[PDB]
Design a protein around this motif. Structure first.
Motif, PDB file in Angstrom:
ATOM      1  N   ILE A 125      55.773  49.943  39.448  1.00 37.45           N
ATOM      2  CA  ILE A 125      56.137  50.333  40.801  1.00 37.45           C
ATOM      3  C   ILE A 125      57.028  49.241  41.367  1.00 37.45           C
ATOM      4  O   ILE A 125      56.533  48.244  41.901  1.00 37.45           O
ATOM      5  N   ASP A 126      58.335  49.415  41.252  1.00 38.07           N
ATOM      6  CA  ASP A 126      59.272  48.463  41.823  1.00 38.07           C
ATOM      7  C   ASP A 126      59.328  48.613  43.336  1.00 38.07           C
ATOM      8  O   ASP A 126      59.213  49.716  43.872  1.00 38.07           O
ATOM      9  N   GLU A 127      59.517  47.491  44.024  1.00 34.07           N
ATOM     10  CA  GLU A 127      59.532  47.458  45.486  1.00 34.07           C
ATOM     11  C   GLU A 127      58.246  48.047  46.056  1.00 34.07           C
ATOM     12  O   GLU A 127      58.265  48.961  46.877  1.00 34.07           O
ATOM     13  N   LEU A 128      57.113  47.510  45.611  1.00 35.66           N
ATOM     14  CA  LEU A 128      55.828  48.045  46.044  1.00 35.66           C
ATOM     15  C   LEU A 128      55.662  47.946  47.549  1.00 35.66           C
ATOM     16  O   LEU A 128      55.105  48.851  48.177  1.00 35.66           O
TER      17      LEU A 128
ATOM     18  N   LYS B 151      61.879  39.614  38.347  1.00 29.64           N
ATOM     19  CA  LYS B 151      60.730  40.508  38.279  1.00 29.64           C
ATOM     20  C   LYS B 151      61.119  41.850  37.676  1.00 29.64           C
ATOM     21  O   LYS B 151      60.469  42.345  36.746  1.00 29.64           O
ATOM     22  N   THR B 152      62.185  42.457  38.194  1.00 30.24           N
ATOM     23  CA  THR B 152      62.683  43.690  37.601  1.00 30.24           C
ATOM     24  C   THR B 152      63.120  43.460  36.166  1.00 30.24           C
ATOM     25  O   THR B 152      62.992  44.350  35.326  1.00 30.24           O
ATOM     26  N   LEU B 153      63.635  42.271  35.866  1.00 29.52           N
ATOM     27  CA  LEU B 153      64.018  41.957  34.495  1.00 29.52           C
ATOM     28  C   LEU B 153      62.810  41.940  33.574  1.00 29.52           C
ATOM     29  O   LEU B 153      62.884  42.405  32.433  1.00 29.52           O
TER      30      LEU B 153
HETATM   31 MG   LIG Z   1      63.145  44.541  41.756  1.00 31.13          MG
END
Ligand SMILES: [Mg+2]
Ligand SMILES: Nc1ncnc2c1ncn2[C@@H]1O[C@H](COP(=O)(O)OP(=O)(O)OP(=O)(O)O)[C@@H](O)[C@H]1O
Ligand SMILES: Nc1ncnc2c1ncn2[C@@H]1O[C@H](COP(=O)(O)OP(=O)(O)OP(=O)(O)O)[C@@H](O)[C@H]1O
Ligand SMILES: Nc1ncnc2c1ncn2[C@@H]1O[C@H](COP(=O)(O)OP(=O)(O)OP(=O)(O)O)[C@@H](O)[C@H]1O
Ligand SMILES: Nc1ncnc2c1ncn2[C@@H]1O[C@H](COP(=O)(O)OP(=O)(O)O)[C@@H](O)[C@H]1O
Ligand SMILES: [Mg+2]
Ligand SMILES: [Mg+2]
Lengths: 752, 449, 172, 58
Positions: free
Chosen positions: A292-295, A240-242
């Motif tokens: 927004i990472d780690e929502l 997802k972050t990728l």
């Molecule tokens: Mg992440």
């Protein structure tokens, strides 16, 4: 249709990248018939489109050796366009390129070392004299000459960004050297090609972030707005972050990144202010994307959140995403592992209108991930990434990156004999000879184990299908059970029946059930999760069923996965049989197990294997097909089986030829396999006692038993005892006969 | 803010997400938040003297608002923006599609009818998905990397009823995003037998919803409850799957103990919330598989245990009682141990109807065998009537196990034939009689007498 | 040349007293890296936003002293499972640690080492590849190993000629 | 408390009812109890500071 956006369609401007034999940095060669097709005259400047938003200007050339569909282009231009060989690049004629008035040049620091003369005097001055070569910003080129050719980075161009080189134009090299590490960072940029598997998910993401910006006329004409919010959810390590990094690196929109806890502040109103500043900065900058990472860190359910700061932050986010003042061309992307922890009002169409499932890839997807991660690695010819894609079952992509890194570390470990930690630098011969072979990948596969399963990892003692004696029918049933749905699902689809995925072993103690589980753990090609019976139960209310749910979820994620309950009767027992047990926590655990194994959710390749001594207490709803389909009775071995057991235990052990294992099996009637193993262990102990006694008497005289003999077995048998009485045998036989008589027919045959 | 509103009078003040600033004062653990709530109360009081300011607010957790702020003179008039009806969804769709280039075959009345729990955000999402489908059909004609798009494609580009059908296939209410489960496709034809049970289910669903006026006129309140009880493997969860796939009502499938939690007061909150979001998405069916987990006879384990299961069942009963007749929430429970269910569940008004799912008789067993093998290549000489005669007491799960065993035997034979072919190089068209006999010699009866 | 970045996250696990802290300190001293120690409970802060603020500040300092070794003693206390714990602060701490360790912005050249008696209590997302690459089990030493430990603690103290560290090396 | 004590070079630190401060780790669920035990451990590991600091428990 769903992935229609990913297609290329063989556009005539797209051309396969190929190596150029004699071209320099500012020129490229394309075949004359292609230049005929493209209405391109020789010597023209062309603007080449490449991956990750990189544009370069090169002078087109006519080559008879170059092919029409291939474009010949050297290392410099490819490293400018961030394109590998074989990739497709777009070409268009540069319109009204104007001769550059002033250009600034800065060389790379690792090349400037070891050079005496002025770089502009030696290389830049002749290269830029009478060159008539277009250049652009962000361009790194190498000029031949001197003791060492120096790579140069086109930092500034006036007019920006592209310009031709003229003699009256001034060339100056003053400034800081550009760091080679920064150039590497520019080259090692994640893009849409760096995401493997998840083609459909990436298609939806591209349809949201790329298509509206590329062709806003489509949505203007169709008369409705594109979706403007993506919630990427999935298990950890699925990328997802990728995907966020790829979106950032490969979109023209302004990208603003938010990490969950970064917003948090002690001061009242400061975290809301940080959020408002983020959205306001995105609004100021035209089309924009906010990630927004780690929502789930900053957007928990307002009903369930006790703190006032967290509830106010969720309300602030809700009002920002969809309030009385609407967003203007702002896309909000978010990534979270636990989507159901997100506040339910954030999950409507106004705010996070589509949720994209970055799930665990299949075999083809993980093959694509393996190719992505091994593109940089220099691989032998023996390496077969397709095999590695097959052997890895529950891996999600971060586990495949770990596998590739582990293979490379093993390759390097193979080379520490020659290489010295003490030496500062490495000779060229070993470094060039350094490569990754298939043995390294096999070692990495052996060590590899899905990160999702790290909690449920237990050592197994390396049993094999050989180590089990007898039980040929059971061995074949288990091998077929685990192997058919994973190896040949084609057959099941063709016959149109779902496989059976439940097995229960019941039989007298010592007869080979946990041994069969060890054999399955080591041999079968599927993940293995071993659960002791009562390790799920907890004193806390409703947490026992939570453990059951999470273990079955771990099995589903890592499918194909074998889930073994070593003592089923502990966790699975008839409902209503007990007086205390909390508020019937045991019965709630039974109900949770029943719902997990056969409920309204669809089925996966999760094979549940249970072993029990006491199959009569188990809840009958557990024993119905669809949950533990087959009840396999592991009885006390018969004489052929006892011969096989004795042969299997003594197979690795030096034994005398006088020993008649057939006679041992004939005498040991009613013995279980555990008893026969005890007989062998006792013979070993007596032999070791004699060996140590001989050693002691030699030490005495100065100041024998290579193999287990027949007298040792005579003594050990004289000690031996039967473990399972006749009463236990009768009880197990009673259960087996009740199950058999349940059919009502000795045998079944169709009428003629 | 309030002074500015007074200065430019007449004025309207809108407080979006009121529950952000106005929580209950007794609950709030901050001093600045309590000062905000008290300042809000003071300005509400001063508002009445203010000649021409009207204060309006919005929130989707109204009970979280301080009880003082709903009194006389402070937010005394309340407006409930509920879930729209079928005509309402038709109006919303007409509003949202007015700019869109609809085709001719598109009908918004069918779309309005098919969307049940949708509120208007969901309908806007539906129209947006239809537009994305209409665009996707043209991605063959024009690609993304292309600079421009042929104007002919733009002219041709319009939204058809097939796009709306695709969007309807994907669309699910925003409320039910948490509780959705991927359910296998099970049609009423996939179930064998239980024809009377099927008809009773369909009627008990559709009668109180489509025709409530007649239920009023005759003076009888409709039943809001069904309990499925029977031997394991006889078709309770199968009927639930069929209802979820086929019937045109929202379905919430929940396991039993998913609601229970260790923290005090959480379990009852989960029960209240799940019944609440069944209410928001009505007409809805709420299914409690293995109901003998959360609804267990009170008092038997009174001495031993934390005692929260009693509060859970009390909350379930309270929700069942408080649920209105006019609200169309059907509650179905499945249990293969019906005795250990609390009697209070079985009292009139809650889970009234008791449907017994028996072991299938001979005709039902023929129907089950035909249903399992409908999609499967089966030899003609396999006589299913004889199989049904021989399997006298078998539950449907046992018959499915027989068919799956026959499948495995045929697969094993085909694999051996392939291995023979690859061995000589260096079969099995369908399921036959001998496979079914080798399978039947294993067949066992799951349910005892 | 080989094309792989080295593993940059290490988790040492074993019972108390097996020397995880001192192993980390030894590695930090012997290599050219500054040793920056983080203790779990001392990071745990009371108000909202100071805990992960301290984590951010710690990582920023350890980047200032590049290269450095970050040792997070008692990772089990600082970072329990986000599903298991009810308190918000622990969940936000775990999320911030994940983001600092691996995110859209990752650490460039720092090696993070954490010690924990019980590794299963660690939130699984930390035990992923990108974050805690390898887990090293520092367990009870065998006979030769405890012989070495006895020699090491006995180097400073004077020993008589009758002393035979092999006796205690076998006995313990 | 440890900071103020270690400021004084000769120090006798008296803890009354340590058991309430630090019960057994596996005995209590409370995570703040694990944190209090670990903080006490890390403080007591280096209380000496090559100084006259001594600690007494009751
Ligand atoms: Mg992440
Ligand atoms: N689908 C994928 N294709 C290629 N590489 C992948 C993929 N998924 C993961 N990886 C690899 O795993 C690394 C880390 O994964 P990543 O950070 O994207 O995981 P994640 O699931 O998004 O986690 P988190 O949301 O907690 O950041 C990436 O840098 C990449 O090397
Ligand atoms: N058929 C066999 N072949 C080889 N070893 C066997 C066999 N049967 C039993 N054993 C021996 O039995 C011992 C362990 O027995 P096992 O764990 O299989 O028993 P079990 O059926 O699980 O019993 P329990 O009811 O106690 O759980 C091992 O020493 C193993 O070698
Ligand atoms: N009437 C039927 N028609 C077709 N298939 C059936 C029928 N009854 C049972 N089956 C088959 O057996 C299984 C049905 O099990 P189901 O989930 O319905 O049982 P259940 O009554 O809920 O039992 P439990 O109490 O054990 O959960 C499925 O595999 C289905 O194919
Ligand atoms: N080789 C060794 N292995 C383990 N412990 C050792 C070793 N050498 C010394 N020790 C002792 O261990 C003591 C404390 O270990 P510690 O650093 O607390 O490990 P942990 O934090 O894992 O318990 C140190 O004071 C040191 O004297
Ligand atoms: Mg066993
Ligand atoms: Mg069921």
């Amino acid at each position: 249709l769903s992935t229609a956006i990913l297609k290329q369609k063989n556009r005539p401007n797209r051309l396969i990248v190929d190596e150029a034999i004699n071209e320099d940095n500012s020129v490229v060669s394309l075949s004359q018939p292609k230049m005929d097709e493209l209405q391109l005259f020789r010597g023209d400047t062309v603007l080449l489109k490449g991956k990750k938003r990189r544009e370069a200007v090169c002078i087109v050339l006519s080559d008879d050796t170059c092919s029409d569909e291939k474009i010949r282009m050297n290392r410099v231009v490819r490293n400018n366009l961030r394109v590998r060989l074989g990739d497709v690049i777009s070409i268009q004629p540069c319109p009204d390129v104007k001769y550059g008035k002033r250009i600034h040049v800065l060389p790379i620091d690792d090349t400037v070392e070891g050079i005496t003369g002025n770089l502009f005097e030696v290389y830049l001055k002749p290269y830029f004299l009478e060159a008539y070569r277009p250049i652009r910003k962000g361009d790194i080129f190498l000029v031949r000459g001197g003791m060492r050719a120096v790579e140069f980075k086109v930092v500034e161009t006036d007019p920006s960004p592209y310009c031709i080189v003229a003699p009256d134009t001034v060339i100056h090299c003053e400034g800081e050297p550009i760091k080679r590490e920064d150039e590497e960072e520019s080259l090692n940029e994640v893009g849409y090609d760096d995401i493997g598997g998840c083609r459909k998910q990436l298609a939806q993401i591209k349809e949201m972030v790329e298509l509206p910006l590329r062709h806003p006329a489509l949505f203007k004409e169709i008369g409705v707005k594109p979706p403007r919010g993506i919630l990427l959810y999935g298990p950890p390590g699925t990328g997802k972050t990728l995907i966020a990094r790829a979106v950032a690196n490969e979109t023209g929109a302004f990208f603003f990144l938010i990490n969950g806890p970064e917003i948090m502040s002690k001061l009242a109103g400061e975290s809301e202010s940080n959020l408002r500043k983020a959205f306001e900065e995105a609004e100021k900058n035209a089309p924009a994307i906010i990630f927004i990472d780690e929502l789930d860190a900053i957007a928990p359910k307002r009903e369930k959140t006790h703190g006032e700061v967290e509830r106010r932050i969720v309300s602030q986010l809700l009002t920002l995403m969809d309030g009385l003042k609407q967003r203007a061309h702002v896309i909000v992307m978010a990534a979270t592992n636990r989507p159901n922890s997100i506040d339910p009002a954030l999950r409507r169409f106004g705010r996070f209108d589509r949720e994209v499932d970055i799930g665990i890839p299949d075999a083809t997807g993980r093959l694509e991930i393996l190719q992505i991660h091994t593109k940089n690695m220099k691989l032998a010819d023996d390496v077969d990434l397709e095999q590695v894609a097959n052997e890895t079952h529950g891996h999600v992509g971060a586990d495949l990156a770990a596998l590739c890194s582990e293979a490379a570390l093993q390759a390097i470990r193979k080379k520490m004999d020659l290489i010295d930690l003490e030496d500062e630098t490495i000779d060229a011969e070993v470094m060039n000879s350094l490569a990754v072979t298939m043995d390294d990948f096999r070692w990495a596969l052996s060590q590899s184990n899905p990160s999702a399963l790290r909690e449920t990892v237990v050592e197994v003692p390396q049993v094999t299908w050989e180590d089990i004696g007898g039980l040929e029918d059971v061995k074949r049933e288990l091998q077929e059970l685990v192997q058919y749905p994973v190896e040949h699902p084609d057959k099941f689809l063709k016959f149109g029946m779902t496989p059976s995925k439940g097995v229960l072993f019941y039989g007298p103690p010592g007869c080979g059930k946990t041994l069969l589980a060890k054999a399955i753990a080591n041999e079968c090609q599927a993940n293995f999760i071993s659960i002791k019976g009562p390790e799920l139960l907890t004193m806390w209310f409703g947490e026992s069923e939570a453990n059951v749910r999470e273990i079955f979820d771990k099995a589903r994620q890592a499918a194909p996965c074998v889930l073994f309950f070593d003592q089923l009767d502990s966790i699975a027992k008839a409902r209503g049989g007990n007086i205390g047990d909390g508020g019937g926590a045991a019965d709630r655990v039974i109900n949770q197990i029943l719902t997990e194994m056969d409920g309204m959710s669809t089925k996966k390749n999760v094979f549940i294997i249970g072993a029990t001594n006491r199959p009569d207490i188990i809840d009958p709803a557990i024993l119905r097909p669809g949950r533990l389909d087959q009840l396999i009775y592991i009885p006390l071995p018969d004489e052929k089986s006892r011969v096989a057991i004795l042969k299997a235990n003594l197979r690795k052990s030096p034994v005398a030829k006088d020993v008649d294992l057939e006679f041992l099996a004939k005498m040991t009637n009613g013995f279980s396999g555990a008893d026969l193993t005890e007989i062998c262990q006792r013979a070993c102990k007596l032999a070791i006692r004699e060996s140590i006694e001989s050693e002691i008497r030699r030490e005495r005289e100065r100041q024998p038993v290579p193999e287990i003999r027949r007298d040792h077995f005579e003594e050990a048998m004289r000690f031996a005892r039967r473990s399972v009485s006749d009463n236990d045998i009768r009880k197990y036989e009673m259960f087996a006969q009740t199950l058999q008589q349940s059919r009502g027919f000795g045998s079944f045959r169709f009428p003629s």
